């Protein structure tokens, strides 16, 4: 139907905007701490601690399959990256501290993304 096409164009355009959002958030991680999944070869107990692992590469796979229906879903995955790290790693670590800085700097990007998503519809 023509309606289904219009919906699909809306999803495509959301995906475009989320791709730009993702690029901007990932620039706030210049150390690449969050770029890839935590390795279960290197951290064998990880899934005992963290039930829903997340990372920027996993988000990008979902994004490119158009698997985010709205900004809420995308933000849920970004918050998992941060929140998982702040639980597994202690306050005095470069990993925790990187997550705090990513959360703080990302907030700015996400605030305007929400306005754009609402504005453009």
UniProtKB/Swiss-Prot annotation:
Domain Bromo, first and last residues per copy: 9-113
UniProt note on tissues of expression: Highly expressed in testis.
Cross-link type Glycyl lysine isopeptide (Lys-Gly) (interchain with G-Cter in SUMO2), residue numbers: 41
Localization, UniProt: Nucleus; Chromosome
Subunit structure as annotated in this protein's UniProt entry: Component of some HBO1 complex composed of KAT7/HBO1, MEAF6, ING4 and BRD1/BRPF2. Component of the MOZ/MORF complex composed at least of ING5, KAT6A, KAT6B, MEAF6 and one of BRPF1, BRD1/BRPF2 and BRPF3. Interacts (via PHD-type zinc finger domain) with unmodified histone H3. Interacts (via PWWP domain) with dimethylated and trimethylated 'Lys-79' on histone H3.
Physiological role: Scaffold subunit of various histone acetyltransferase (HAT) complexes, such as the MOZ/MORF and HBO1 complexes, that acts as a regulator of hematopoiesis. Plays a key role in HBO1 complex by directing KAT7/HBO1 specificity towards histone H3 'Lys-14' acetylation (H3K14ac), thereby promoting erythroid differentiation.
Protein name: Bromodomain-containing protein 1
Source organism of the structure: Homo sapiens (Human)
């Amino acid at each position: 139907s023509m309606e289904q096409v219009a919906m699909e164009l809306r999803l495509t355009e959301l995906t475009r905007l989320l791709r730009s959002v993702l690029d901007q958030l990932q620039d706030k991680d210049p150390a690449r701490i969050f770029a890839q999944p935590v390795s279960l070869k290197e951290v064998p107990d990880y899934l005992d601690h963290i039930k829903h692992p997340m990372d920027f590469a996993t988000m990008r796979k979902r994004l490119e399959a158009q698997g985010y229906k709205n900004l809420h879903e995308f933000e849920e995955d970004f918050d998992l990256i941060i929140d998982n790290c702040m639980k597994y790693n202690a306050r005095d670590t470069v990993f925790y501290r990187a997550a705090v800085r990513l959360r703080d700097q990302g907030g700015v990007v996400l605030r305007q993304a929400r306005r754009e998503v609402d504005s453009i519809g």
